[PDB]
Design a binder for this molecule. Structure first.
Ligand SMILES: Cc1cc2nc3c(=O)[nH]c(=O)nc-3n(C[C@H](O)[C@H](O)[C@H](O)COP(=O)(O)O)c2cc1C
Ligand SMILES: Cc1cc2nc3c(=O)[nH]c(=O)nc-3n(C[C@H](O)[C@H](O)[C@H](O)COP(=O)(O)O)c2cc1C
Ligand SMILES: Cc1cc2nc3c(=O)[nH]c(=O)nc-3n(C[C@H](O)[C@H](O)[C@H](O)COP(=O)(O)O)c2cc1C
Ligand SMILES: Cc1cc2nc3c(=O)[nH]c(=O)nc-3n(C[C@H](O)[C@H](O)[C@H](O)COP(=O)(O)O)c2cc1C
Ligand SMILES: O=C(O)[C@@H](O)Cc1c[nH]c2ccccc12
Ligand SMILES: O=C(O)[C@@H](O)Cc1c[nH]c2ccccc12
Ligand SMILES: O=C(O)[C@@H](O)Cc1c[nH]c2ccccc12
Ligand SMILES: O=C(O)[C@@H](O)Cc1c[nH]c2ccccc12
Lengths: 353, 353, 353, 353
């Protein structure tokens, strides 16, 4: 009985080792954040437009100018290989088969190059900056291997206090490795090359990365660039002013700061202020959640745990299934509210509760 | 111990096969919609008018100009024959005995003609449009058989995702049939007559039926015509502009779109804008729910599951009982708030919570 | 362990026959009303005034011009004899010992005269009108026996639908009788005297009693007169205009209409509009509930179930105990908020939540 | 598994005798107050400032002009010796080791002098006034022994009705004594000296202590003076007008008046009106609670039960641990919201929910 994302979560919890399941499902501190990410969607209800011809519906939509089957993406998530063998590839392939982009995490279990070589869909690369020099290396790799978009994640200055991992003393599975970091020279005896090892043996990122650093990166990357982790129209506007082609409003699926607002709380305002593509994630599970954000102006929604449940439960076929249900879910919702074309969504179909 | 509608639900759940019970009680997706339909009534409380002579009370009221014992109706519900033998007839007879209208669903287990022949109460016909041509046939049948009012249901462009039926793999009982469709010629070898079979072997409706189509129907039907499934003062106003004699605000008892607003949320506004009869359903279980909607301007309330619980629990006598309790409930409520005449209800007796 | 009213309820439920307990604790329909009566008190919180000399506190206060130990009264409740032997007397004596009034219900188990003969405290008489003629008789009896105040209860036009009694098929204990009605001549063969029996064998009241009838009563009774059962500043104002010396805002302890507002919701407005004594009841259990209403302008609070729990649990000594705890509770609360004199309470010490 | 304050509470409940645990954890009456103290923090959520260099963070801050490691203090709590041997000393030492002040309660199990002799950190003395004369004695003792700050607690005019202690018939452990009162002469046969014994054998305080009395105290104490127990910007402003150097907004950890507002409800207003140091306590458990109050203008937060859980669970080492976790918690939170310097906190980083 697999008819929604929740059913896949249930199945995933039965198949995953508790430790891994907690790594996946867990949130920061009390986990009031993740609950909030879910609850915030009830602040809006639908006001369908009747007697509208919805016999022919369309979910197609442009994201940053490029058309894709639907306004969805499989967002960047670390250690997918722990959920299922070659998890990263299984995800990218289901995404490509669904006609939507896939974002490879800097902390993936499959390197930037190997994926690009084994998958021809639209690949995006999410970037964390541990060491500026090493950062430039990955960016260039992703560039030379055909990744169309770069995403800078900024909400992990320091690691979120996730008590589930603490209790379980979570440890990256032995057979898994941070493949994008493998090979990084450790022979040089001079300056860097040694302070670099300091960063490399340090599971902590460059907390100094600031606006000036964003400029640096904007020059390095010539294609579409997005800043992820924003929770304010002000920050989103600055990102656009500094060169970003768009932003991703999110609270990292409630895994960084338990009391962070839901990005849904600043979506309309960010959309109105930036005048540029505003994507979003964190809390999405139902097609209705997705449509509400879209109706509010979001350009597209990135899926995090949702598709991961499909991966953990049934691997690649599982992701396909989740993507299928969600597409059907979205389509069904568009029909129900009388908005046959997904690109015509607006605040009109919503009611503030 | 049968003193309220809830008691009948309990009894019905004990007598119905789980599968049928779920078909009856179930809602869309998470079923937050049905819960909401119930909760919305707590947003209003009573402010009784004391020292008012309520020794002589009257529940009589005109609905679309015709007087009936009380502002209630047994709304259109499909597959009543699955709840109890000849369920459709049992309902129409209890309605007629109570002095209120009965609405026969396009998907009833008893045909338009047979009911009209076995029942002389005020019969209304609810219409779904699968095939325009077949639609015209039923409308004319209902017309020639004496049905006084036609109701076009518009919130089923596509079928609601009702997960209870999915888990149970619900299937229309073998001994039951969609009687209003039986007999529809299947011999013609030409154009229609074959594309018609396409609609007929397709448990899916004409999602293209739009405002232009409403005009078509308005000409075909010469008597009172209502549009059901509206959830906005705007749509209700358009319906009036297009010819409708009134509208029925509803979210299909939370069975079509889980996140739909409750029609109670747009009742006052629809009443103020249309200046025409505004009926309502979805969530009604207590006389107090009914009075609140009436106090807000509703012309009458259509009962869905409430009377069905009486049917499933004790057949025709069960419906009589439910109608009796509710009438007593309403009467008792009118007395309590100091409004002896139901036609004098107004926002005055309410308090926004 | 008896330290609050709730502890007495617990004890009372252990000693009372379920049937009687349900008669006492029960409310109308779903009983959302009684829950609401309790919850409404959380809409206000205290803002104590520090460094105020509260070494000498005073709970004394005038009620309708007459001073009493504290702004409390044991309100009118029917069938007290079912809770404990000679319940009516036990209550009046504890009230008198506490220095506050006691209100005898028209439906008491001890007649107006017998109580007045066995108790010298301040006795008030609550009146229900079944038959105008019989009503005049009781009023005059209460008048000639020294009752200082008359209270007309108006929220029982018809009896509240209390499902607990329905399930239990509640029946007035055999050894108990409606003593204020006993003796009423049944010999006359003429007009009244026979239509009177119609009222007397009818556990239903005069639902016609209106404003004109209030005038009638205002002339009959020469002393202090209050109208009980009001739930609107408008009705309270009319009562004053018609002669009442004050009013009692209440929803009959949530026993008449489940969806009625809490009188706390219209207390400030009634106080501001009438410019006359506004008393209140329904939901009071803690001293803090009492102080909040007092701070809002209430002249005094009538206790219903609270003192009855003391009666049912430990008879007369039980009521004394409840009154003692509550007085200590109130006193302690006054001290805590820095208002040493109960007559100085005002909206200042409150915070709208 | 000790990763947060709650874990220490759990451990403390397993090690403490129920009676003592209830004395520590318990609140007034229904204990809606303590729940409220916790819930009020959800009325605010964070809006992090991204791409801010937080590689170098600072929690240092001035409190009343004196710098300390972080804006925290271990507040005054009575009978710490009942939670753990020499509890008072264990607390002061952990506080001193953490670089923050410690406040000794008038009702401590270790006298003002002994502590000052065994601990060289910044010691503050909280004062209750039972007898003015005895009060002056303790103040002078604290003065001559080096206590830098005096804190007058005003929310215990009378003792809070704490039903847990009532049920348990709580009694101060035999081996424990109110050491600051020990030795107080009981030989004098004259006036005071006998009315003093009246206060001394009276576990009740001087409820008359008013503003005039505050003036008296302001002259007596030459150093920093704070008034604790305030719940209104008005009272805080008066305190400043009367000489106070600052105030401590608090409801005594919900132990005095169950329906008291949370001091968080008047923090911003008190900060805006007084223009002077406004400290706060009551309900703090997470670093996020602390940052929210700080962001709202609080000068520092006093810990009550939080550090006591560490004491009861693991003595002095337990307190160190709690202080360590909280410091790490605060630091981590500052980083997450993009405010590297704790002294730069402002309403900007908050979102009203
Ligand atoms: C197991 C797991 C690992 C994650 N790893 C990363 C990562 O490596 N890079 C990144 O930018 N975001 C990371 N995220 C955050 C996601 O990109 C996304 O913001 C989040 O999951 C959205 O919320 P949702 O899970 O409710 O959909 C991770 C989330 C989860 C659940
Ligand atoms: C078992 C069941 C079948 C239904 N079938 C139909 C139908 O055939 N035509 C229609 O117009 N509405 C249909 N409805 C919707 C009802 O007309 C009505 O809008 C709804 O039940 C109102 O909500 P309530 O059940 O809370 O009263 C159905 C509802 C139920 C519960
Ligand atoms: C067992 C019971 C019997 C009652 N009988 C009467 C009555 O005879 N006359 C009347 O005026 N009110 C009557 N009341 C209502 C009370 O006067 C009062 O309004 C109500 O109890 C207040 O609410 P509380 O119970 O929460 O205090 C009754 C209430 C209870 C619980
Ligand atoms: C066991 C216990 C004893 C207390 N004793 C005192 C005292 O002697 N003097 C004082 O000023 N406050 C006293 N308080 C109140 C605290 O100073 C502080 O206001 C309160 O604990 C803050 O709330 P929290 O426990 O949620 O942090 C006490 C609190 C507790 C829990
Ligand atoms: O919460 C998150 O998203 C990160 O902690 C993932 C993450 C796990 N191991 C890493 C090594 C370097 C950079 C990021 C990671
Ligand atoms: O939810 C509803 O109300 C419909 O699905 C009922 C329904 C069940 N079988 C049908 C065949 C044709 C038209 C409508 C129906
Ligand atoms: O709810 C209430 O307060 C009344 O029903 C009490 C009540 C019980 N038996 C009666 C006979 C005559 C008048 C009132 C009563
Ligand atoms: O709740 C509180 O904080 C006080 O009751 C503590 C307290 C306990 N015993 C005492 C003796 C004298 C002064 C205060 C106390």
């Amino acid at each position: 009985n697999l008819f929604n994302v929740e059913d896949y979560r249930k199945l995933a919890q039965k198949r995953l080792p508790k430790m891994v399941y907690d790594y996946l499902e867990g949130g920061a501190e009390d986990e009031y954040g993740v609950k909030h990410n879910r609850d915030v969607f009830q602040q809006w209800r639908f006001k369908p437009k009747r007697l509208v011809d919805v016999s022919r519906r369309s979910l197609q939509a442009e994201v940053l100018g490029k058309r894709q089957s639907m306004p969805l993406l499989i967002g960047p998530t670390a250690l997918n290989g722990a959920l299922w063998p070659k998890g990263d590839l299984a995800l990218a392939r289901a995404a490509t088969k669904a006609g939507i982009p896939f974002v490879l995490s800097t902390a993936s279990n499959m390197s930037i190059e190997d994926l690009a070589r084994q998958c021809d869909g639209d690949l995006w690369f999410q970037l964390y900056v541990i060491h500026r020099e090493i950062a430039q290396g990955m960016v260039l790799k992703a560039l030379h291997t055909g990744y169309t978009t770069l995403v800078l994640t900024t909400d992990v200055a320091v690691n979120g206090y996730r008590e589930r991992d603490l209790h379980n003393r979570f440890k990256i599975p032995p057979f898994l490795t941070l493949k994008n970091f493998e090979g990084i020279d450790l022979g040089k005896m001079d300056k860097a090359n040694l302070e670099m090892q300091a960063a490399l043996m340090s599971r902590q990122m460059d907390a100094s990365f600031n606006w000036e650093a964003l400029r640096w990166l904007r020059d390095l990357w010539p294609h579409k660039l997005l800043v992820k982790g924003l929770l304010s129209a002000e920050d989103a506007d600055r990102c656009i002013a500094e060169g970003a082609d768009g932003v991703i409003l999110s609270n990292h699926g409630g895994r960084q700061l338990d009391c962070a607002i839901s990005p849904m709380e600043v979506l309309a305002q960010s959309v109105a202020k930036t005048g540029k593509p505003v994507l979003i994630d964190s809390g999405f599970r139902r097609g209705s959640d997705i449509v509400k954000a879209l109706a509010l102006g979001a350009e597209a929604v990135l899926l995090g745990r949702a598709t991961l449940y499909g991966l953990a439960a049934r691997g690649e076929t599982g992701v396909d299934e989740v993507l299928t249900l969600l597409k059907a879910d979205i389509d069904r919702t568009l029909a129900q509210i009388g908005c046959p074309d997904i690109t015509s969504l607006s605040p009109d179909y919503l009611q503030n509760e």
